[PDB]
RNA sequence: GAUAAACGCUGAAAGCAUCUAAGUGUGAAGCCCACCUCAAGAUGAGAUUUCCCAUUUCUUUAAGAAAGUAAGACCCCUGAG
RNA sequence: GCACCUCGAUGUCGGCUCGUCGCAUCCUGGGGCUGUAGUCGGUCCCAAGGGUUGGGCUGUUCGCCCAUUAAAGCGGCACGC
């Protein structure tokens, strides 16, 4: 037994970031945003304590889908009843519920009880404006 | 149409056209020579 | 658009002016007080509260008598709403009398059904029996639960579980009379409901 | 690209703007507007204006021919206009106009009404032949094709609606 | 300790591995436990080490 | 309303032709709505209207304990739609 | 065909009740060609939304026969239970 910082539940200070989505594909937005919400890019890990940040995503209507996948990435849901697949969605979700496209980051995280806490720090807005301007967020460029 | 895996011209006026991931044979000489790959 | 609640009384017959017998139900009404007007600016949609009877004053509460008190009536039992109506034309506290359905003649009637307790798997769904003789023992059973391979039972394999208690519309019925002085609409046909219940009556959706 | 380098001769009555990617063409009849790609460049040297482009692609050649043919359609449609005249064989078929309402008695128990958009008229000289005019070619083609789809011809007697010059084949089948 | 060294190394522009190659060219051989503790606490010393690792592989 | 097979309009690569790469349409009991029902334990637990406003102990005043109440609900009794 | 599998013990095919899925489609729906005049048809492409009868003779899987119907599909689910 020796000395490494097992950080505690009430020491970590969190921040608020703004990330645009104007013509960036889904995989790389979700990659950088999902690496943020676990508290990476800070030297104060635990694999327990929610050392993450808060992510706000703006302009979800203008996310690239490269080449095809506009008519092709058929999502699927089944509803536990016979004859019950509902392949209703497509790349339609860019138009209707561009918030919902909250699946391609919910996949990227673990499925513990921290992958349910750290999912509730996304706030994905299809438009271009916060409702959260009272908490002073900052901007992240992406050359990543 | 005729939908065959193998497709050849039939007349002098048969012209091979790609329209999608497909191969056509289109004739003004007869309507009998419409051909698909499938 | 047009909407009047009310009660259920019974069943009659009426000769029409050509002389044919027609089966006829009896629906009452009252004065018909509008309670609130819901707008997009405060509620996000557009509707109208409406309620039909007169309680005694022993049988309500200070929130109910505060909610009624911007219309100056007695406290009323059956408060419901109505959607899809272009408003104008509606002050707080009017009376939507029986006059509205004189020549409406095509009407959706939305009662609530009776109740019959636990019953068998036949009387809900009309599943047929098995044979009552030639040595069998399979008189009145609900069948087999499915195949063997999935190691479970699929959903919606219907079994026992209480008959009735849920609300059922019937579309495109006719109106026979409107008796304003006695507060009675007469309807051809059959209304789902026990007596003294509620019945909503609307102008039908399917033209 | 032997169409991609032919010269666009502008007659009298040609007024051309440049608004970002917009290339608008005024004139004696019409005000046709589009947009194009940034890989194309306009020219000067009065009224014969051509196109020269950044080359060294794999394609090199498609968008040249399309833009030259489309601007020749632009300039001709502003100047003259286009005609695609139709006919009515199958005796007992009519065509009547009350303003902008075609009535076609082609043997149904109807019907047949056909309305019109703005820049297209319908000229009916006699009870058979119908003429369609206007500015574009695409709009005129779609309206003429929608007229043809009401009753396209047959290979046995040849009723219905044609071009002025279709080649409708006749398969003289027996009476049984 | 690798994840914490990666985070605090990316804080100084160096990638997550070029510290290793840079320090082993500059002949510096700290255990990664002690680099983890310095990368958490001593920001000045960790930037000093990171600048010498920048200095080594700048050939 | 967007599609399937099919039919086109304009147009070049390939001075012609050509439904297609640029762009622009018609198109089925099928897909998504429209018809009836359930539905905020939708732990992302939503929204509106109306009703009710303060003793003791100090533990050391902290999102402390303890006690009689308000709006209101329940226990018990006569019953059935 | 082989013998991995179940011998301190796993019941045979039809019928009754109850269904569910696939598409190489029986009817209904949309199309292309014709050695398609019309009424009928032949073949091929898309398409699984719903529907698919009572009897007579055999223990029957098979079948044959009578009378109907828009039609009286082929299969998987321990040759379903
Ligand atoms: Zn040919």
CATH number of the domain enclosing D72: 3.90.930.12
- Residues C27 and C9: beta-carbon distance below 8 Å: yes
Sequential DSSP letters for D55-94: --SS--SHHHHHHHHHHHHHHHHHHT-----B--BSSS--
d(CA D17, CA C168): 66
Task: Output the CA torsion A64→A67→A68→A74 (10° steps).
Answer: -40
Instruction: Specify whether D24 is located in the same domain as D43.
Output: yes
Determine contact, residues C24/C176, Cβ cutoff 8 Å.
yes
What is the C-alpha to C-alpha distance for residues A18 and A68, in angstroms, rounded to an integer?
Answer: 28
How far apart are the C-alpha atoms of D18 and D36, rounded to whole Å? 11
What does DSSP say about strands D25-26 and D8-9: parallel, antiparallel, or unpaired?
Answer: unpaired
User: How was this model experimentally determined?
Assistant: cryo-EM
- Residue D16, helix vs strand vs coil: strand
Q: How far is the CA of D160 from the centre of ligand 1 (A)?
A: 27
List, in order, residues 6 or more apart from E19 with CB less than 8 Å away: E5, E9, E49, E50, E53
* Interface touch E8/A40, C-beta < 8 Å: no
Would you call D42 helix, strand, or coil by DSSP? coil
Q: What is the chain E residue with the closest CA to A2? A: E33
Sign of CA dihedral C93, C94, C97, C103: negative
Q: Which residue of chain A is at minimal alpha-carbon distance from E41?
A: A43
CA C153 to chain centre: 35
Q: Is residue D31 part of a domain?
A: yes
Assigned domain for D141 exists: yes
Residues D45 and D101 occupy one common structural domain: no
Annotated binding-site positions of B: 11, 14, 27, 33
* Together in a domain, D8 and D75: yes
Q: How many pairs of residues across A and C have Cβ atoms under 8 Å apart?
A: 7
In whole angstroms, give the CA distance from residue B9 to residue B33: 8
Q: Are E15 and E54 in contact (CB under 8 A)?
A: no
Question: In sequence order, what are the beta bridge partners of C132?
Answer: none
DSSP calls for A21-56:
-TT-BHHHHHHHHHHHTTT-SSS---SSS----EEE
Residue B33, judged by CB atoms within 10 A of its CB (0-12, 13-18, 19+), counts as middle
C164 Cβ contact list (under 8 Å, min separation 6): C113, C114, C115, C116
Length of chain E: 59
How far apart (Å, rounded) are the C-alpha atoms in residues C11 and C14?
Answer: 10
**D58 and D8, same structural domain?**
yes
Q: Look-up: residue for tokens 């003004």? A: B28
Taking the C-alpha atoms of residue C202 and residue D10, their distance in angstroms, rounded to an integer, is 68
Question: Which chain A residues touch E10 with a CB distance below 8 Å?
Answer: 41
**How far in angstroms lies nucleotide F13's C1' from the CA of residue D66?**
9
The domain boundary residue, chosen from D79, D105, D127: D79
Please give the Cα distance from C62 to C75 (Å, whole number).
10
Which one of A4, A40, A42 has the shortest CB-CB distance to E36? Answer: A4
**Residue D149 approaches strand G within 7 Å at CB:** no
> In this structure, is residue D17 part of a structural domain?
yes
Q: Do the Cβ atoms of D148 and D86 come closer than 8 Å?
A: yes
Give the separation between CA D108 and CA D151, rounded to whole angstroms.
10
In a domain, D88, yes or no: yes
- The backbone torsions φ and ψ at residue A111, rounded to the nearest 5 degrees and listed phi first, read -120, 35
- Tell the residue number behind the tokens 């092709």, with chain if given: A72
Q: Which of D13, D44, D79 is the last residue of a domain?
A: D79
User: Does A45 contact E37 at a Cβ distance shorter than 8 Å?
Assistant: no
Give the domain-ending residue among D79, D106, D134.
D79
The two three-digit tokens of residue C169, written as one number: 């519309």
**Dihedral angle of Cα A65, A66, A67, A73, to the nearest 10 degrees:** -40
Please check whether strand G approaches the CB of B11 to within 7 Å: no
Q: Looking at beta carbons, which residues of chain C come within 8 Å of A82?
A: 154-156
D90 and D102 assigned to the same domain: yes
From the Cβ of C127, is strand G under 7 Å away?
yes
Alpha-carbon distance A61 to A127, whole Å? 7
Q: Are residues D32 and D87 in the same domain?
A: no
C141 CA vs G50 C1’ separation (Å): 28
Residue-range definition of the domain harbouring residue D154: 82-163
Distance between Cα B2 and ligand 1 center (Å): 13
- Answer whether residue D60 is part of any domain: yes
D174 assigned to some structural domain: no
Q: Please give the residue of chain C at the shortest CA–CA distance from A81.
A: C155
- Among C52, C74, C56, C55, smallest CA distance to C8 is for C52
CA distances from C100 to C2, C180, D135 (A): 7, 10, 56
Work out how many CB contacts closer than 8 A connect A with E. 25
- Which residue do the tokens 């002085």 mark? C181
Among A43, A46, A48, A53, the residue to mutate for chain E (most E Cβ within 10 A): A43
- Please, are residues A63 and A25 in contact by the beta-carbon 8 Å criterion? yes
Q: Number of folded domains in chain D?
A: 2
Nominal resolution (angstroms): 3.5
Say whether both D74 and D86 belong to one domain: no
Half-sphere exposure of A4 (CA within 13 A, CB side): 16
Task: Confirm whether D176 is domain-assigned.
Answer: no
Tokens of D92: 């007992």
Measure the CA–CA gap between D146 and D51, rounded to whole angstroms. 35
Tokens describing residue C126: 């009309």
Asked if residue D145 and residue D101 are part of one domain, the reply reads yes
Residues in Cβ contact with D88 at an 8 Å cutoff, skipping those fewer than 6 apart: D94, D95, D106, D127, D128, D129, D130, D161
Contacts of C90 (CB under 8 A, 6+ apart): C34, C37, C48
Same domain, residue pair D88 and D155: yes
Q: What are phi and psi of E36, to 5 degrees?
A: -70, -45
Which residue(s) pair with B35 in the sheet?
B2, B25
Q: How far is the CA of B31 from the centre of ligand 1 (A)?
A: 8
**For residue B35, how far is its CA from the centre of ligand 1 (angstroms)?**
10
Neighbours of C82 (CB within 10 A): 19
3+ Cβ–Cβ pairs closer than 8 Å linking A and B: no
Phi-psi region for residue D99, left (φ > 0), alpha (ψ -120 to 50) or beta?
A: left
Same domain, D64 and D127: no
Q: Are the CB atoms for A22 and A60 separated by under 8 Å? A: no
Task: Please check whether residue D8 lies inside any domain of the structure.
Answer: yes
């Amino acid at each position: 037994m020796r000395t490494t910082y097992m950080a505690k539940a009430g020491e970590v200070e969190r921040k608020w970031y703004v990330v645009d989505a104007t013509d960036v594909p889904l995989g790389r937005l979700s990659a950088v945003v999902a690496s943020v919400l676990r508290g990476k890019n800070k030297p104060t890990f635990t694999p327990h304590v929610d050392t993450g940040d808060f992510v706000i995503v703006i302009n979800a209507d203008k996310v690239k889908l490269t080449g095809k996948k506009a008519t092709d990435k058929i999502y699927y849901r089944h509803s536990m009843y016979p004859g019950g697949l509902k392949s209703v969605t497509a790349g339609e979700l860019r138009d209707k519920n561009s918030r919902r496209l909250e699946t391609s980051v919910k996949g990227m995280l673990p499925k513990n009880t921290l992958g349910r806490k750290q999912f509730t720090k996304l706030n994905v807005y299809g438009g271009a404006e916060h409702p959260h301007a009272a908490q002073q967020p900052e901007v992240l460029d992406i050359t990543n | 149409m005729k939908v065959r895996p193998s497709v050849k011209p039939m007349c002098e006026h048969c012209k091979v056209i790609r329209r999608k991931g497909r191969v056509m044979v289109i004739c003004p000489a007869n309507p009998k020579h419409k051909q698909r790959q499938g | 658009t047009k909407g009047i609640l009310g009660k259920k009384v019974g069943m009659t017959q009426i000769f029409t002016e050509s002389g044919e017998l027609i089966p006829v139900t009896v629906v009452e009404a009252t004065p018909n007080v509008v309670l609130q007007v819901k707008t997009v600016e405060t509620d996000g949609y557009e509707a109208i509260q409406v309620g039909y009877q007169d309680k005694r004053e022993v049988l309500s509460n200070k929130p109910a008598k505060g909610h009624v008190a911007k219309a100056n009536t007695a406290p009323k039992r059956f408060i419901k709403e109505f959607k899809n109506v272009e408003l104008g034309e509606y002050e707080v506290g009017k009376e939507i009398k029986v006059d509205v359905f004189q020549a409406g003649d095509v009407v959706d009637v939305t009662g609530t059904t009776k109740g019959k307790g636990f019953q068998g798997a036949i009387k809900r769904h009309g599943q047929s029996r098995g044979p009552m003789s030639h040595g069998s023992r399979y008189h009145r059973r609900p069948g087999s639960m499915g195949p063997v391979a999935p190691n479970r039972v699929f959903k919606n394999k219907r079994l026992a579980g209480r008959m009735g208690g849920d609300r059922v519309t019937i579309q495109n019925l006719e109106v026979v009379k409107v008796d304003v002085e006695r507060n009675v609409i007469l309807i051809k046909g059959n209304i789902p409901g026990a007596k003294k219940s509620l019945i909503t009556i609307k102008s039908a959706v399917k033209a | 690209s032997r169409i991609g380098n032919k010269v666009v001769v502008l007659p009298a009555g040609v007024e051309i703007k440049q608004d970002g990617n917009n290339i608008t063409v005024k004139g004696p009849k019409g005000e046709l507007t589009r947009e194009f790609s940034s890989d194309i460049k306009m020219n000067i040297e009065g009224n014969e204006v051509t196109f020269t482009r950044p080359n060294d692609s794999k394609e090199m050649k498609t968008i040249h021919g399309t833009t030259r043919a489309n601007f020749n359609n632009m300039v001709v449609g502003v100047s003259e206009g286009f005609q695609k005249a139709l006919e009515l064989i199958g005796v007992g078929y009519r065509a009547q106009v009350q303003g902008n309402k075609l009535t076609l008695n082609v043997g149904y128990s109807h019907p047949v009404e056909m309305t019109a958009p703005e820049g297209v008229t319908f000229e009916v000289p006699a009870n058979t032949q119908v003429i369609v005019k206007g500015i574009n070619k695409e709009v005129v083609g779609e309206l003429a094709a929608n007229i043809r789809g009401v009753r396209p011809p047959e290979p046995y007697k040849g009723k219905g609606i044609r071009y002025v010059g279709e080649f409708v084949r006749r398969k003289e089948g027996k009476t049984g | 300790w690798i994840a914490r060294i990666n985070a605090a190394a990316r804080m100084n522009g160096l990638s997550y591995s070029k510290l290793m190659h840079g320090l082993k060219l500059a002949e510096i051989d700290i255990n990664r436990k002690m680099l983890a503790d310095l990368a958490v606490n001593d920001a000045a010393a960790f930037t000093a080490l990171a600048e010498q690792a920048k200095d080594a592989l700048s050939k």
